Amino acid sequence: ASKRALVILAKGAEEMETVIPVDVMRRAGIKVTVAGLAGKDPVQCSRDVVICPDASLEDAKKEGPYDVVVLPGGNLGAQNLSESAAVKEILKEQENRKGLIAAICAGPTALLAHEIGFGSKVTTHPLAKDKMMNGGHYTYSENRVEKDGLILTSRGPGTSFEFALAIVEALNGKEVAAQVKAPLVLK
Amino acid sequence: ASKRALVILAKGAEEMETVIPVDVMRRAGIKVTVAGLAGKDPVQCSRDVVICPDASLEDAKKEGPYDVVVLPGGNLGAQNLSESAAVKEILKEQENRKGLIAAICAGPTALLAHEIGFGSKVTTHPLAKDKMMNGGHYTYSENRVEKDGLILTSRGPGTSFEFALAIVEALNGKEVAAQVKAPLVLK
Ligand SMILES: *[C@@]1(=O)C(=O)N([C])C2=[C][C]=[C][C]=C21
Ligand SMILES: *[C@@]1(=O)C(=O)N([C])C2=[C][C]=[C][C]=C21
């Protein structure tokens, strides 16, 4: 059975951090649902790229659970994710079932907001470190991609391929990740 | 005056190769128009990400000329660009005025289709080399980003940041490109 990914798309999400994981995961044969936080309508990302979600989050939640829940970054995107009771419920459910949770850039700050994965080693964008570390509930890492417990984190647009390929490896194995990687012309 | 970029978005475009340059160029303060080849409606990219263009190509052409015309890749996207008389006209005009033309992955094959920049050194995705080189009208390069005459080319999703930053450097200078690069957390 194909693995399934939920990518939660809020206004102000970093569009590179949204599209790179969606694309790379689809290349791996993962069934990806791009779910609009606010509903079914198109989402204005941080740099004004407008993306049409596959579904509302409300509708996508009904089709859960998912093998991974992915939280893109962007400060304002992450803030919207952090303020959402629906996001809280999804992440709590995912944590309770020991499923993978993946977040990049400022995205991991939504884990703090929703009290998810406390005690884990995490990374973030450098500019989001202080927010993430308020209260010392996580252990900070400068690795480009970090994985600890349920929790897979990464730093920025320039770590998005690595982040996406780490998701692929977690879900579909190292050989699939390598096969998906080769045609991308990565460094 | 801000520099201006036209990014031509066709069905089957590689969404990473579309979004990374749009985003990075906007970070550099370039005014970017994402122009829909087919009209104003949303565009289904190669991996099913749906992007809403800023304008139709028909409308964006009226607001030309641009400091750069950017052609994303994706085989079917590039084919659509190659078949378009509107694209032909835009690229011919840009070449005639000695403006920058930038293409990635299979995107450079549209330059061949429209007889643009013959004699230039170019790169492409490895799988698009034979198509690009039919007739020996260009000189092939394996560099991740290649620039020769008017013509800036690059290889794939994994060279998209380098490609975008090379555009930024060409338009806004090396220091702006460096400033935009640093917060991205690139390797
Ligand atoms: C991330 O996308 C993000 O969330 N943050 C705070 C950031 C800063 C600079 C560049 C990228 C990003
Ligand atoms: C490019 O986006 C493209 O145009 N081509 C042919 C390709 C092949 C593999 C991976 C990326 C790409």
Side-chain angles (χ1 to χ4, degrees):
Chain A
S2 298
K3 303 291 175 91
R4 301 169 68 237
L6 180 69
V7 176
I8 311 181
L9 178 55
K11 185 172 160 68
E14 221 303 325
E15 44 269 73
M16 297 183 286
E17 296 166 19
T18 303
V19 173
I20 289 161
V22 169
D23 182 324
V24 168
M25 285 188 294
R26 289 180 171 150
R27 286 170 176 267
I30 301 166
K31 302 166 170 180
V32 181
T33 303
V34 179
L37 183 65
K40 311 174 166 164
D41 294 339
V43 179
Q44 191 186 355
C45 296
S46 66
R47 268 73 185 179
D48 286 339
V49 173
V50 177
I51 295 172
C52 298
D54 300 318
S56 63
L57 185 61
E58 187 185 319
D59 285 344
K61 161 60 186 283
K62 300 168 191 156
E63 303 301 318
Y66 296 85
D67 302 286
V68 63
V69 178
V70 182
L71 307 184
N75 277 331
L76 285 64
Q79 187 66 53
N80 282 324
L81 299 172
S82 294
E83 294 178 346
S84 171
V87 175
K88 188 180 314 286
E89 175 181 42
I90 288 161
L91 294 173
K92 287 284 189 198
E93 177 186 36
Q94 188 75 336
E95 180 175 41
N96 283 336
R97 69 190 289 275
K98 302 182 184 173
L100 185 64
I101 295 169
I104 185 162
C105 215
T109 66
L111 307 179
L112 173 63
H114 296 313
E115 301 192 320
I116 303 292
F118 283 9
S120 304
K121 187 175 281 212
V122 302
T123 197
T124 68
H125 194 275
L127 298 171
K129 176 189 181 174
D130 291 350
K131 182 176 280 281
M132 189 67 177
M133 287 301 290
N134 185 346
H137 293 293
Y138 306 94
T139 296
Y140 202 75
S141 165
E142 296 193 330
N143 287 322
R144 293 173 65 78
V145 179
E146 189 55 74
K147 172 58 179 313
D148 191 38
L150 308 183
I151 307 292
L152 199 158
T153 53
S154 189
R155 310 202 81 181
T159 66
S160 290
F161 286 97
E162 294 155 77
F163 172 69
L165 288 165
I167 297 166
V168 170
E169 177 169 349
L171 296 188
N172 287 351
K174 179 188 186 66
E175 168 60 338
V176 168
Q179 294 163 358
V180 168
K181 179 171 182 189
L184 300 179
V185 204
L186 287 162
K187 265 160 177 173
Chain B
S2 298
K3 303 291 175 91
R4 301 169 68 237
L6 180 69
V7 176
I8 311 181
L9 178 55
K11 185 172 160 68
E14 221 303 325
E15 44 269 73
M16 297 183 286
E17 296 166 19
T18 303
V19 173
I20 289 161
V22 169
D23 182 324
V24 168
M25 285 188 294
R26 289 180 171 150
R27 286 170 176 267
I30 301 166
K31 302 166 170 180
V32 181
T33 303
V34 179
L37 183 65
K40 311 174 166 164
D41 294 339
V43 179
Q44 191 186 355
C45 296
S46 66
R47 268 73 185 179
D48 286 339
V49 173
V50 177
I51 295 172
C52 298
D54 300 318
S56 63
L57 185 61
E58 187 185 319
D59 285 344
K61 161 60 186 283
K62 300 168 191 156
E63 303 301 318
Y66 296 85
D67 302 286
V68 63
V69 178
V70 182
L71 307 184
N75 277 331
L76 285 64
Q79 187 66 53
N80 282 324
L81 299 172
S82 294
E83 294 178 346
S84 171
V87 175
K88 188 180 314 286
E89 175 181 42
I90 288 161
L91 294 173
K92 287 284 189 198
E93 177 186 36
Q94 188 75 336
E95 180 175 41
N96 283 336
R97 69 190 289 275
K98 302 182 184 173
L100 185 64
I101 295 169
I104 185 162
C105 215
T109 66
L111 307 179
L112 173 63
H114 296 313
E115 301 192 320
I116 303 292
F118 283 9
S120 304
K121 187 175 281 212
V122 302
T123 197
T124 68
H125 194 275
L127 298 171
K129 176 189 181 174
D130 291 350
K131 182 176 280 281
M132 189 67 177
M133 287 301 290
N134 185 346
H137 293 293
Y138 306 94
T139 296
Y140 202 75
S141 165
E142 296 193 330
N143 287 322
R144 293 173 65 78
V145 179
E146 189 55 74
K147 172 58 179 313
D148 191 38
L150 308 183
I151 307 292
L152 199 158
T153 53
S154 189
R155 310 202 81 181
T159 66
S160 290
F161 286 97
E162 294 155 77
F163 172 69
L165 288 165
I167 297 166
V168 170
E169 177 169 349
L171 296 188
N172 287 351
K174 179 188 186 66
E175 168 60 338
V176 168
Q179 294 163 358
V180 168
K181 179 171 182 189
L184 300 179
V185 204
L186 287 162
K187 265 160 177 173

